[PDB]
Ligand binder design. Structure first.
Ligand SMILES: CCCCCCCCCCCCCCCCC[C@@H](O)O[C@H](CO[C@H](O)CCCCCCCCCCCCCCC)COP(=O)(O)OCC[N+](C)(C)C
Ligand SMILES: CCCCCCCCCCCCCCCCC[C@@H](O)O[C@H](CO[C@H](O)CCCCCCCCCCCCCCC)COP(=O)(O)OCC[N+](C)(C)C
Ligand SMILES: CCCCCCCC/C=C\CCCCCCCC(=O)OC[C@H](COP(=O)(O)OCCN)OC(=O)CCCCCCC/C=C\CCCCCCCC
Ligand SMILES: CCCCCCCC/C=C\CCCCCCCC(=O)OC[C@H](COP(=O)(O)OCCN)OC(=O)CCCCCCC/C=C\CCCCCCCC
Ligand SMILES: CCCCCCCC/C=C\CCCCCCCC(=O)O[C@H](COC(=O)CCCCCCC/C=C/CCCCCCCC)COP(=O)(O)OCCN
Ligand SMILES: CCCCCCCC/C=C\CCCCCCCC(=O)O[C@H](COC(=O)CCCCCCC/C=C/CCCCCCCC)COP(=O)(O)OCCN
Lengths: 71, 83, 105, 129, 114, 70, 303, 347, 98, 99
């Protein structure tokens, strides 16, 4: 169950990031919305910076350092 | 024979710490190869599930692989419970 | 120079630590396990010169996984454009990126 | 996101190295080196390496720099490259370190022989005559 | 090079399981015993496809099966389960060792009913 | 006599009593009246994060029981 | 409400250390057929306050020629380490719960020699320098054996977590499992804090005094947790707190008793004591404690 | 020191060298280098005095710095490519630091300054060991990464090494400094053919090791550390002086002696690789090494220097402790030119 | 390649330059060597932990052990030099010259 | 964040109380009127450093008990401790622990 929920949450976060990318990158001349940085079409696990790039600093800091700082 | 016994007697006096240290170290070296429970410890270490057991793709020719955890097929840990 | 004792004797003295995808304890995977596996399988049995000439795509993908330079450049460009637009004022973040969303398990 | 705390610690590390690299009054260079070692421990512990950070902070600071000070006294951007998943129900760093006895037999053998040889070398050099 | 395909938000919509970790831990053994088939199908597909986007239907199925499991628990043995998971939730480590008594009460209620 | 030593030992005993009881009381107060959740190994931390997301008040110790399953 | 927890951990330790000195005098006095302070206060209870006020009103004899820097830093580091060493310990619940608490305590003790080194070097005298070198050598020598003993004992615990020691000793004390290691640990903790029979040596002076006494009480508490495990009931931690404080006070009184009972070693005599009696036994028992869980198939769980 | 301790230290040195050559992991190679450095220091300090201690501390400083630079090269290579196997370097910056660290270990110019001083400080047996056995490991590591080295850097450092050795050998009276400068020049000759053919490098290494073993054993046989003390050898053992003159002629590259083989083969290979100016410069520069070899031979055997009255008592006593393999080393270092095509074994 | 790695590399370069300067006091030379090793340790630890290459967690401990052994060797050599000359000044090592 | 705050509180209290201790008796006006270098201390310091390094090698033992290679792990740990004992014995026999 945890694996399924994690996959669904990651996919939703990626989709929201893609939608906001489409909104922002409209007037950029040579930008392609949702373009890969890898030649292969295989699924690649996203970084912390890909999912929380455009979000608030509080939850970015949480998702990156909370487990280390939780004592 | 007699010389070794006399040397051990002389060392047990005025040098008990070294005799005890050597005895404990040598005993700790020899004993594990003779004790029968080291196999039990290895089995307990193998029987500890750290990862998720990934299921196998059934093809109709695996009688030893269970289809449900409650099925008799597969390893049993009744020996650990009896310990 | 290189006296290859190990392969002659089949000893495996220090090969177990050479690559990420080689028998990690508790089957812990490397971050770039798949890319390194693909590159190694591409370049096996071919030679260094031909491996460099032919397996360049796999090596590029592996290095991109390792250092993520292109990903950081892309994210920085997106963030810079977003900051420029919010500075001018034609863009407003949605509630998802302002902490007012509905979280899920 | 606290103003690039990793960047701040790295800069403090660099300033500490600038401080003790000028080599003024070797005791003060020593204090600069303890400061820089503590900052490096902070960096390692903040990144996620608890055991390796404590390894530095114990061995390096308490033994090696202490012997250095003893001998002197006798004389006159970030957060994006991180992971996404979890580690299971154990710390990967500690398990990989503890695999030294099950996997790194060669490493243990060579390190132990090197330390014994180093003891012999120290005794021979300090013999004098 | 290429475009990453991501399923739309309508494909990710499903009735979530809104119970806490202690509640899940209290029924973890029975949940594993009962809901094993969809979970194993999902996990086999997960390691075989190596792609999260290829396993959405199995995730929905396992969510539905877990929901059915919890609905049966609520229908039959709500109160012993409530006591058991409250006990589990009180402890910081969530130890099964603490209240084998409540565990046995829940187990006997489940065995008698379902 | 020897029992005149006792007042100082009792003062030290109370002083040493204060930290443990204070910490336990603060842990109960700040964790919804229950024992503080300890989280090593990065899995129970994920459990705490999931509980925080499920609670709806951004607090992990607020437990949602079987009544939230509808 | 975390600053409140930190203050309620720190201040009672300071009161206990101040009161501990009064207790020490009374115990020694009654072992010497006399009384301790009993005039200042009902039973000498006001003696620590008078001592503190007199120390804080007397001028500090700064040499006016040495480096003021380390002269002021050394008490800071000493007191900071002494107060910081308290947080990892679980009574029953630790202020800060760390996975590798034991290594943290060991690293703190390792840094504890820098205060001695800097105080000796900043005294601007060669004789105090010799004394500081002797003390530093003794401390590092005995901390080696501390580390070996501690890892050998934790081999029966499963990890370096201090909270797990309570679960390990739920049914039996660790004193029964390994009493020789406890004996050597007790002696090494005596030699660590420069306590008799190993004691070869106004504001900052009292600073160092409180640092040393906090280290003493901390060492007794750590020994009690490591070797005399109390039962912990999650619904009433006050019982565990009371039992732990009783054991810690018993061990502190044991240090006072040992000081009042024995003459003191020479420097070379204690150096030989360590390097020729404790280290061989420590290595032999480390080998034995490595081998024992494997022989008996009793390896501790957590990993 | 105790013979057991000396034998164990020698074993540790050679086992570190073996671990360096047989390991496929960068960390194990670094460990072998550390083991070699750790066990080498007491050998340099077998005869305790201020000179040996100063030489040993200079050597330790240089080798520790080189090892740290090598470790950073390994770290940067790992950063830019998650590989530990000794293969192509994968980073331009990493290669530059690895090359400089290995050259500092070898003593190539401009990292040559420590070699003459360390050779002068230590005794003759220590100098023999330092100049023979301490080159196997860095040269093996360089041969393993031959396709990665920047040819410009390797060739310019080799040319600098040859020039420095040839120029510095002219000013020396002590023999140990002469051997050190000869070692520097031969190191440059070895490392200038690495980008083209490592077999030539190994052949030059073997010929150099044989010749320098013969020369150091001859210097041990007749207790001479300066030119004048060597000039007294003809009065007691003229055979030693004649053999040393023949060996010195061999080291200069004069045919038909063995020393001509490495220069000839390296020049031939580099002319295969369309390089013409460099081998000519190498030959005209090695003429200087030949000049100071000729001066030493003049002072040693081709003339008779004045003697002393006390040599008559030395006439009556025989060299008691006789070393083996000296005739074999001389024969190999003088008369193996006709067996040149045997280099195809990839020695 | 992020900025933390750049900072660590600059720290190592600063330590190397300080080692190569030699104002005086060989003790400072050993201090610079140890600082270089500390930079090596921190950088290797970050690189190894970042990529989740579990089997390489062994390496920093081995590096620290070997480098501290080398540091002890250098300390012994410096002690003997100082005992010979009375001080650890660099210029006293001028008896052997090129 | 918690341990940083705890360390900051410890250092802050220590500094504040040390400064008040050093400044309270200064407000009122008053009159306000080598070579030896023993080798044994350095030798024991170096011995401590070497044994500390070998202890650092020996530290990860508690997790090494769960590897499924119990025989190999036991052999390696016993080998490390045996070499520690051998180092101590070698320093003992040639008078490395004398005063
Ligand atoms: C002064 C002239 C040189 C004299 C050299 C010393 C002569 C005595 C040495 C005694 C025997 C040495 C070798 C030991 C015999 C078995 C070793 C064998 O199993 O190893 C082989 C190694 O082969 C040996 O090296 C060949 C030995 C022949 C050396 C003599 C060649 C000298 C030619 C020019 C001088 C004329 C010499 C005249 C007689 C001495 C396998 O090679 P391999 O591991 O797979 O590849 C590694 C090498 N790579 C990396 C370059 C590819
Ligand atoms: C063949 C030539 C032998 C004589 C020449 C010796 C040369 C110098 C001595 C050094 C060589 C020793 C070889 C040790 C290499 C280790 C690998 C080999 O021994 O196999 C190991 C066998 O393990 C044994 O326990 C090794 C014990 C041997 C070490 C004890 C004595 C070592 C002394 C060596 C010299 C050190 C100084 C002198 C000490 C007296 C690995 O066990 P295994 O389980 O399959 O694989 C682990 C990987 N897993 C996780 C996938 C399972
Ligand atoms: C002083 C000691 C500094 C570090 C002590 C704390 C060590 C520690 O383990 O705490 C780390 C803790 C949790 O780690 P785990 O125990 O593994 O468990 C986490 C999962 N529940 O989280 C943290 O890392 C928080 C602190 C990290 C950042 C700051 C570290 C301290 C830096 C101190 C720098 C000052 C040095 C001054 C020089 C000293 C010279 C005498
Ligand atoms: C466990 C609890 C222990 C608590 C720790 C100790 C706390 C100490 C508290 C100190 C209380 C204040 C000390 C006041 C007395 C200071 C010493 C003193 O008497 O000096 C008198 C001195 C004499 O100087 P002269 O006569 O002019 O010159 C003679 C030489 N030619 O006069 C002074 O300087 C007086 C100073 C003004 C003090 C007035 C305020 C009282 C103190 C307030 C508390 C301040 C800190 C809290
Ligand atoms: C085979 C197992 C290996 C592992 C076990 C050992 C691990 C740790 C123990 C060894 C630590 C280091 C030992 C170093 C030994 C040094 C001996 C020495 O030099 O001391 C001699 C003296 O010591 C001796 O007599 C030499 C050895 C004495 C006996 C040693 C033990 C011999 C075997 C005893 C045990 C036999 C087996 C156990 C059976 C017991 C019955 C159950 C000089 O002493 P000084 O302090 O200088 O005194 C001078 C002024 N009086
Ligand atoms: C079948 C498997 C069984 C496994 C075998 C295990 C059995 C082990 C049996 C042997 C145990 C012996 C080790 C116990 C400690 C030994 C330490 C020692 O021997 O050192 C003393 C020295 O120790 C001291 O003298 C230090 C004393 C300092 C004063 C301390 C006072 C202690 C009394 C107060 C109470 C102590 C409380 C201890 C327990 C604390 C619990 C937390 C001997 O040295 P010397 O007399 O000088 O002789 C050398 C020349 N021949």
């Amino acid at each position: 169950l945890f694996q399924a929920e994690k996959d669904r949450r990651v996919l939703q976060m990626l989709r929201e990031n893609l939608e906001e990318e489409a909104i922002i990158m409209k007037d950029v001349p040579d930008w392609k919305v949702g373009e890969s940085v890898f030649h292969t079409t295989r699924w690649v696990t996203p970084m912390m910076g890909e999912l929380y790039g455009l979000r608030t600093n509080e939850e970015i800091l949480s998702a990156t350092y909370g487990f280390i700082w939780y004592t | 024979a007699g010389r070794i016994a006399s040397f051990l007697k002389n060392a047990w006096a005025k040098e008990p710490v070294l005799v005890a240290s050597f005895a404990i170290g040598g005993l700790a070296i020899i004993l594990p190869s003779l004790s029968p429970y080291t196999n039990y410890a290895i089995r307990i270490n193998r029987a500890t599930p750290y990862n998720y057991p990934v299921p196998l793709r059934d093809d109709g020719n695996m009688p030893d692989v269970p289809s449900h955890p409650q099925d008799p097929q597969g390893p049993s840990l009744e020996w650990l419970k009896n310990l | 120079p290189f006296f290859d004792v190990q392969k002659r004797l089949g000893l495996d003295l220090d090969r177990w630590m050479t690559i990420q995808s080689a028998e990690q304890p508790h089957k812990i995977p490397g971050r770039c396990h798949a890319f390194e596996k693909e590159w190694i399988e591409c370049a096996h049995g071919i030679g260094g010169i031909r491996a460099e000439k032919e397996c360049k795509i796999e090596f590029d993908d592996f290095v991109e996984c390792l250092l993520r330079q292109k990903t950081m450049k892309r994210l920085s460009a997106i963030k810079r454009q977003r900051d420029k637009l919010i500075k001018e004022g034609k863009y407003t973040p949605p509630p998802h990126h302002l902490g007012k969303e509905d979280p899920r398990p | 996101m606290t103003m690039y705390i990793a960047f701040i610690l790295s800069t403090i590390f660099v300033i500490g190295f600038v401080g003790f690299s000028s080599k003024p009054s070797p005791i003060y260079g020593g204090l600069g080196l303890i400061v820089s070692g503590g900052v490096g421990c902070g960096i390692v512990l903040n990144f996620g390496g608890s055991f390796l950070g404590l390894m530095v902070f114990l061995i390096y600071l308490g033994g090696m720099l202490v012997v250095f000070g003893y001998t002197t006294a006798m004389a006159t951007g970030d957060w994006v490259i991180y992971d996404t998943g979890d580690s299971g129900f154990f710390s990967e760093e500690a398990m990989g370190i503890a695999a030294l006895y099950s996997y790194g037999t060669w490493l243990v053998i060579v390190t132990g022989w090197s330390l014994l040889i180093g003891v012999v070398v120290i005794m021979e050099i300090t013999r004098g005559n | 090079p290429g475009i990453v395909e991501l399923p739309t938000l309508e494909d990710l919509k499903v009735q979530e399981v809104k119970v806490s970790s202690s509640v899940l831990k209290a029924a973890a053994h029975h949940y594993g015993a009962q809901c094993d088939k969809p979970n194993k199908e999902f996990m086999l597909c997960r390691w075989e496809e190596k792609d999260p986007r290829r396993c959405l239907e199995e995730g929905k199925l396992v969510n539905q099966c877990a929901l059915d499991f919890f609905r049966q628990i609520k229908r039959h043995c709500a109160e012993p389960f409530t006591e058991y998971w409250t006990c589990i939730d009180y402890s910081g480590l969530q130890l099964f060792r603490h209240c084998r008594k409540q565990q046995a009460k829940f187990d006997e209620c489940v065995l008698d009913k379902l | 006599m020897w029992f005149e030593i006792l007042p100082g030992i009792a003062v030290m005993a109370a002083c040493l009593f204060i930290p443990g009881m204070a910490t336990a009381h603060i842990h109960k107060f700040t964790n919804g009246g229950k024992e503080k959740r300890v989280a090593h190994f990065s899995y129970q931390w994920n459990l705490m994060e999931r509980d925080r997301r499920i609670s709806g008040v951004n607090r992990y110790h607020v437990t949602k029981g079987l009544e939230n399953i509808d | 409400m975390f600053m409140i927890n930190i203050l309620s951990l720190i201040i009672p330790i300071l009161l206990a250390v101040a009161f501990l000195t009064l207790v020490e005098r009374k115990v020694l006095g009654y072992m010497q057929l006399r009384k301790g302070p009993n005039v200042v206060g009902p039973y000498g209870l006001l003696q620590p306050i008078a001592d503190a006020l007199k120390l804080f009103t007397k001028e500090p004899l700064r040499p006016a020629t040495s480096s003021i820097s380390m002269f002021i830093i050394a008490p800071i580091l000493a007191l900071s380490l002494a107060l910081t060493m308290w947080v990892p310990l679980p009574m029953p619940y630790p202020l800060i719960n760390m996975n590798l608490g034991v290594l943290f305590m060991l690293a703190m003790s390792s840094l504890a020699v820098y205060s001695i080194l800097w105080s000796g070097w900043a005294s601007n005298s060669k004789y105090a320098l010799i004394g500081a070198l002797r003390a530093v050598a003794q401390t590092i020598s005995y901390e080696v054996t501390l580390a070996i003993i501690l890892l050998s004992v934790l081999l029966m615990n499963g990890s370096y977590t201090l909270s797990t020691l309570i679960t390990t000793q739920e049914h039996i004390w660790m004193i029964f499992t390994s009493w020789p290691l406890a004996m050597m640990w007790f002696i090494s903790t005596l030699a660590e804090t420069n306590r008799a029979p190993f004691d070869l040596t106004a504001g900052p002076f009292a600073m160092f005094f409180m640092a040393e006494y906090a280290n003493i009480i901390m060492m007794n508490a750590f020994t009690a947790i490591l070797f005399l495990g109390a039962s912990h009931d999650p619904h009433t931690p006050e019982l565990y707190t009371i039992n732990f404080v009783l054991k810690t006070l018993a061990l502190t009184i044991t240090f006072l008793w040992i000081r009042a009972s024995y003459p003191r070693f020479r420097y070379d005599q204690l150096m030989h004591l360590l390097w020729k009696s404790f280290l061989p036994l420590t290595l032999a028992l480390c080998m034995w404690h490595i081998s024992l869980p494997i022989m008996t198939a009793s390896i501790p769980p957590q990993s | 020191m105790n013979p057991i301790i000396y034998t164990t230290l020698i074993m540790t040195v050679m086992s570190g060298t073996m671990l360096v050559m047989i390991s496929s992991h960068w960390l194990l190679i670094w460990i072998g280098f550390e083991m070699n450095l750790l066990a080498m220091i007491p050998v340099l300090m077998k005869n305790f005095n201020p000179r040996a201690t100063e030489a040993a501390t200079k050597y330790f400083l240089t080798q520790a710095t080189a090892s740290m630079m090598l470790m950073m090269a390994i770290i940067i290579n790992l950063l830019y490519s998650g590989q530990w196997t000794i293969t192509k370097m994968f980073n331009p910056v990493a290669m530059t630091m690895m090359t400089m660290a290995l050259a500092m270990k070898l003593g190539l110019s401009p990292f040559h300054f420590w070699v003459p001083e360390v050779t002068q400080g230590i005794s003759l047996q220590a100098g023999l060991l330092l100049l023979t056995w301490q080159k196997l490991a860095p040269l093996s590591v360089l041969c393993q990464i031959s396709q990665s080295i920047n040819p410009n850097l390797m060739l310019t450092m080799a040319m600098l090494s040859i020039l420095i050795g040839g120029w510095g050998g002219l000013n020396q009276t002590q023999l140990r400094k002469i051997m050190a400068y000869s070692s520097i020049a031969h190191m440059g000759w070895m490392t200038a053919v690495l980008p083209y053919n490592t077999t030539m490098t190994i052949l030059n290494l073997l010929i150099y090791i044989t010749m320098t073993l013969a020369m150091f054993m001859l210097l041990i046989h007749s207790s001479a550390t300066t030119t004048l003390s060597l000039s007294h050898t003809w009065n007691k053992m003229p055979v030693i002086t004649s053999l040393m003159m023949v060996t010195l002629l061999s080291m200069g590259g004069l045919p038909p002696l063995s020393g001509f083989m490495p220069k000839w083969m390296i020049i031939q290979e580099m002319t295969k690789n369309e390089s013409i100016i460099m081998p000519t410069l190498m030959a005209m520069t090695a003429l200087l090494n030949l000049y100071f070899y000729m001066r030493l031979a003049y002072s040693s055997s081709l003339t008779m220097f004045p003697s002393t009255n006390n040599m008559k008592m030395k006439w009556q006593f025989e060299h008691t402790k006789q070393m083996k393999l000296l005739p074999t080393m001389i024969v190999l270092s003088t008369l193996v030119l006709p067996m040149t095509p045997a280099l195809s074994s990839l020695n | 390649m992020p900025l933390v790695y750049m900072n660590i590399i600059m720290a190592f370069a600063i330590a190397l330059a300080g080692l190569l300067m030699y104002r005086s006091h060989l003790m400072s030379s050993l201090l610079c060597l140890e600082g270089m090793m500390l930079s090596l340790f921190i950088m290797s630890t970050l690189i190894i932990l970042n990529t989740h290459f579990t089997l390489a967690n062994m390496m920093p401990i081995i590096l620290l052990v070997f480098a501290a052994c080398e540091a002890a060797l250098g300390l012994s050599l410096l002690v003997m030099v100082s005992n010979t000359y009375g001080t650890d000044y660099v210029q006293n090592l001028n008896l052997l010259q090129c | 964040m918690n341990i940083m705050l705890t360390l900051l509180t410890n250092v802050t209290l220590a500094s504040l109380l040390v400064l008040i201790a050093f400044w309270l008796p200064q407000l009122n006006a008053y009159s306000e009127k080598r070579l030896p270098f023993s080798m044994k201390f350095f030798l024991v310091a170096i011995t401590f450093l070497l044994f500390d390094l070998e202890i650092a090698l020996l530290l990860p033992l508690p997790w090494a008990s769960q590897t499924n290679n119990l025989k190999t792990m036991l052999t390696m740990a016993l080998f490390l401790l045996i070499l520690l004992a051998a180092s101590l014995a070698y320093e003992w026999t040639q008078k490395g622990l004398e005063w």
